[model samples]
Target: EGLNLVATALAVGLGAIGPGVGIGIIVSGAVQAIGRNPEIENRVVTYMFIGIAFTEALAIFGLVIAFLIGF
Candidate 1:
């Protein structure tokens, strides 16, 4: 029981790391792009949000997997 809980926690933690870093990098690049071209800020922001959503979905999936494993 204890080992299963530990494994679930680790799975969730490790899963989040990738998406967290990915979103950071995505936002960082978007910010740079907006800074360089103010006119395309709207479009850039839109795309950034889309990217964030996809990245976040992976994290959510990870959480679901952890739940399944833990249960």
Candidate 2:
């Protein structure tokens, strides 16, 4: 039981890795877009937020798993 708990905790924590990388990639793309269209920075930022939220959903999933494991 203890090992299971430890493994679950680690899995939940480490699962954030993919989401982090995804957000990084999205930000890089957004930055490139902004560089290309400095006049539309606001629009670019708005789209960036949507991308960020999608990326953040993965982290939220990991957090939910961690919460379930704590029980």
- Taken over the whole model, the C-alpha lDDT of each candidate is 0.92, 0.84
Candidate 1 lDDT tens digits, 36-65? 888998889999999999999999989998
lDDT, candidate 1, at 33: 98
TM-score of 1: 0.91
Which lDDT value does model 1 have at 2? 84
lDDT of 2 at 34: 84
Candidate 2's C-alpha lDDT?
0.84
User: CA lDDT of 16 in candidate 1?
Assistant: 93
Window of ten residues with lowest summed lDDT in model 2: 1-10
Which has the greatest lDDT?
Answer: 1
Window of ten residues with lowest summed lDDT in model 1: 1-10
Q: TM-scores across all candidates?
A: 0.91, 0.82
